[PDB]
Write a protein that binds this ligand. Structure first.
Ligand SMILES: CSc1ccc(Br)cc1CC(=O)N1C[C@H](C(N)=O)CC[C@@H]1C
Ligand SMILES: [Zn+2]
Length: 138
């Protein structure tokens, strides 16, 4: 679990969005596993606007932050799940690191701000949904 709070927006994994997120929908994209909903209170976070390929992510299944090197945002094949059929997930960045399904929503940050959130994983892999291209967030 986890979300980004910027301005009057809340950014979450689309597959974890609540009834309230859908009732206050701003934008969603199944191909990116992202959903943005509106909030009444002002948000705490800054979004990075950079091309960093190194950063730190929070891993809830270890209660720890880990440093990572990650690939540039791209179209990557993701196996069928309870939430989506087999498809290419876009704007996804992969890195070598530990992750489990419940780690989705953990923030990836660089020196400039929030880069994205955990969205996929594998055997010693972790994938992040990029948010740096969503200029309208701030
Ligand atoms: C951190 S997720 C993870 C981690 C390790 C392993 Br093995 C497997 C996973 C599961 C995973 O990749 N998922 C991503 C998928 C998607 N984004 O389309 C939705 C379902 C599920 C949460
Ligand atoms: Zn950066």
């Amino acid at each position: 679990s986890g979300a980004i709070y910027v301005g009057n927006y809340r950014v979450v994994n689309r597959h974890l969005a609540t009834h309230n997120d859908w009732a206050n929908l701003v934008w969603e994209d199944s191909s990116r596993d992202l959903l943005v909903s509106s909030t009444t209170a002002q948000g705490c976070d800054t979004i990075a606007r950079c091309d960093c390929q190194t950063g730190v992510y929070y891993c809830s299944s270890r209660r720890k932050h880990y440093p990572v090197s990650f690939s540039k945002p791209s179209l990557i094949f993701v196996e069928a799940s309870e939430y989506y059929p087999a498809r290419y997930q876009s704007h996804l960045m992969l890195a070598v690191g530990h992750s489990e399904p419940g780690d989705c929503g953990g923030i990836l940050r660089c020196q400039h701000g929030v880069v994205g959130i955990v969205s996929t994983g594998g055997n010693g892999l972790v994938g992040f949904a990029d948010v740096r291209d969503l200029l309208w967030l701030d």
